Design an enzyme around this catalytic site. Structure first.
Site, PDB file in Angstrom:
ATOM      1  CB  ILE A 101      -1.360   3.218   6.226  1.00 13.84           C
ATOM      2  CG1 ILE A 101      -0.109   2.511   6.718  1.00 13.84           C
ATOM      3  CG2 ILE A 101      -2.056   3.947   7.363  1.00 13.84           C
ATOM      4  CD1 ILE A 101       0.970   3.423   7.203  1.00 13.84           C
ATOM      5  CB  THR A 153       6.205  -4.379  -4.709  1.00 10.79           C
ATOM      6  OG1 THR A 153       6.792  -3.131  -4.309  1.00 10.79           O
ATOM      7  CG2 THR A 153       5.650  -4.078  -6.084  1.00 10.79           C
ATOM      8  CG  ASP A 161      -0.010   8.641  -1.477  1.00 11.11           C
ATOM      9  OD1 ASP A 161      -0.732   9.430  -2.125  1.00 11.11           O
ATOM     10  OD2 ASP A 161      -0.432   7.494  -1.283  1.00 11.11           O
ATOM     11  CG  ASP A 183       8.940   0.969  -8.312  1.00 14.76           C
ATOM     12  OD1 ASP A 183       8.389   1.463  -9.338  1.00 14.76           O
ATOM     13  OD2 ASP A 183       8.247   0.326  -7.484  1.00 14.76           O
ATOM     14  N   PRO A 208       4.340   8.382  -7.579  1.00 13.83           N
ATOM     15  CG  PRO A 208       2.816   9.683  -8.801  1.00 13.83           C
ATOM     16  CD  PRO A 208       3.739   8.495  -8.922  1.00 13.83           C
TER      17      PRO A 208
HETATM   18  N1  LIG Z   1      -3.351   7.158   1.259  1.00 20.43           N
HETATM   19  S1  LIG Z   1      -2.848   8.315   2.152  1.00 20.43           S
HETATM   20  O1  LIG Z   1      -2.486   9.412   1.405  1.00 20.43           O
HETATM   21  O2  LIG Z   1      -3.782   8.647   3.116  1.00 20.43           O
HETATM   22  C1  LIG Z   1      -1.398   7.757   3.000  1.00 20.43           C
HETATM   23  C2  LIG Z   1      -0.208   7.544   2.292  1.00 20.43           C
HETATM   24  C3  LIG Z   1       0.935   7.134   2.972  1.00 20.43           C
HETATM   25  C4  LIG Z   1       0.881   6.917   4.359  1.00 20.43           C
HETATM   26  N2  LIG Z   1       1.999   6.545   5.046  1.00 20.43           N
HETATM   27  C5  LIG Z   1       2.887   5.681   4.517  1.00 20.43           C
HETATM   28  C6  LIG Z   1       2.493   4.766   3.550  1.00 20.43           C
HETATM   29  C7  LIG Z   1       3.438   3.912   3.012  1.00 20.43           C
HETATM   30  N3  LIG Z   1       3.062   2.959   2.137  1.00 20.43           N
HETATM   31  C8  LIG Z   1       3.367   3.047   0.725  1.00 20.43           C
HETATM   32  C9  LIG Z   1       4.887   2.918   0.637  1.00 20.43           C
HETATM   33  C10 LIG Z   1       5.303   2.786  -0.826  1.00 20.43           C
HETATM   34  C11 LIG Z   1       4.645   1.549  -1.434  1.00 20.43           C
HETATM   35  N4  LIG Z   1       5.050   1.416  -2.843  1.00 20.43           N
HETATM   36  C12 LIG Z   1       3.131   1.688  -1.350  1.00 20.43           C
HETATM   37  C13 LIG Z   1       2.713   1.811   0.110  1.00 20.43           C
HETATM   38  N5  LIG Z   1       4.713   3.945   3.488  1.00 20.43           N
HETATM   39  C14 LIG Z   1       5.040   4.847   4.438  1.00 20.43           C
HETATM   40  N6  LIG Z   1       6.223   5.069   5.019  1.00 20.43           N
HETATM   41  C15 LIG Z   1       6.038   6.082   5.902  1.00 20.43           C
HETATM   42  N7  LIG Z   1       4.725   6.452   5.833  1.00 20.43           N
HETATM   43  N8  LIG Z   1       4.151   5.685   4.932  1.00 20.43           N
HETATM   44  C16 LIG Z   1      -0.310   7.148   5.055  1.00 20.43           C
HETATM   45  C17 LIG Z   1      -1.437   7.565   4.377  1.00 20.43           C
END
Ligand SMILES: NS(=O)(=O)c1ccc(Nc2cc(N[C@H]3CC[C@H](N)CC3)nc3ncnn23)cc1
Length: 291
Positions: A10, A14, A79, A120, A123
């Site tokens: 998913i 960083t 997100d 940091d 969106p």
């Molecule tokens: N691209 S999306 O909208 O379908 C999507 C976004 C976030 C997540 N879930 C997620 C994604 C995520 N990854 C992000 C975290 C922040 C980082 N800078 C970039 C990856 N961290 C998370 N913590 C809890 N949930 N979660 C799942 C689908």
């Protein structure tokens, strides 16, 4: 790691790869993050386990085994970046913008009160559910590990939401950096266009300077003596705010303006922003999420 089954990648962050995973024992669905370890990181990450709030993605567990590092978070499905894109045609309705802002100021007010900053916000670390909740992800991690230019996959980290004190070489970050970033994200939700999309540190500085006027000693005492300040900076005039975020209303522009003050000490605190008239008629709408 083997206590979990990887459902799907998913994304990448960083600090390493992020997987949707399931707890083989409990069947809980989680976000599993493998971090790229030192004892300070351990004690810092552990402090973060206590720092619990409904508008902060919950850190379920910190696994230090096999000398490797994994973080289990509560799982959210979307997100704000992807939601904003899904929403391009008419934009997010102002009630939902307002509710999101209000909730995140709640999370910030909490962590900031324990002296914990994000450093940091963007969106992609704001996560939403179908209850109409939005949550801050990776809170505290930047002080835990160390903010880099490129990710492990050489993805360029965004400067778009970076506060001017940081860009100007300020060694010591206050909580005002998060308000600034939140202010940028606020403006982006309203206009459907990033406020300051710089592609270099100087381009970022100079985009801010163009919109908000080159900071001087009048608006920002001590600015000229900041490590990366140069008298040679071009001198731009502040633009109108009615020009910056139309068609946001007086209250909103009033609020955004205080969140984007140059001098971090004059910047509105999360605490005080919650009391701003913009939030007088706040509600909690449910978004139409397509999962
Ligand atoms: N691209 S999306 O909208 O379908 C999507 C976004 C976030 C997540 N879930 C997620 C994604 C995520 N990854 C992000 C975290 C922040 C980082 N800078 C970039 C990856 N961290 C998370 N913590 C809890 N949930 N979660 C799942 C689908």
């Amino acid at each position: 790691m083997e206590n979990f089954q990887k459902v799907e990648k998913i994304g990448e962050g960083t600090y390493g790869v992020v997987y949707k995973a399931r707890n083989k024992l409990t069947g809980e669905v989680v976000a599993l993050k493998k971090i790229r370890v030192p004892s300070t990181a351990i004690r810092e990450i552990s402090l973060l386990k206590e720092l619990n709030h409904p508008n902060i993605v919950k850190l379920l567990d910190v696994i230090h085994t096999e000398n490797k590092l994994y973080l289990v978070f509560e799982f959210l499905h979307q997100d704000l970046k992807k939601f904003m894109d899904a929403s391009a045609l008419t934009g997010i309705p102002l009630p939902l913008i307002k509710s999101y802002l209000f909730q995140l100021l709640q999370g910030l007010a909490f962590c900031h009160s324990h002296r914990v900053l994000h450093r940091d916000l963007k969106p992609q670390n704001l996560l939403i559910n179908t209850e109409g909740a939005i949550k801050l992800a990776d809170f505290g991690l930047a002080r835990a590990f160390g903010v880099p230019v490129r990710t492990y996959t050489h993805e360029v980290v965004t400067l778009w939401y970076r506060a001017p004190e940081i860009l100007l070489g300020c060694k010591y970050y206050s909580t005002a950096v998060d308000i600034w970033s939140l202010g940028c994200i606020f403006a982006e939700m309203v206009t459907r266009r990033a406020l300051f999309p710089g592609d270099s540190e100087i381009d970022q500085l100079f985009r801010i300077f163009r919109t908000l006027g080159t900071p001087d000693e009048v608006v920002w005492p001590g600015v000229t003596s900041m490590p990366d300040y140069k008298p040679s900076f071009p001198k731009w005039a502040r633009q109108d705010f009615s020009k910056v975020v139309p068609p946001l209303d007086e209250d909103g522009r009033s609020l955004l303006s205080q969140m984007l003050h140059y001098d971090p000490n004059k910047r509105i605190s999360a605490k005080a922003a919650l009391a701003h008239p913009f939030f007088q008629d706040v509600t909690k709408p449910v978004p139409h999420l397509r999962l």
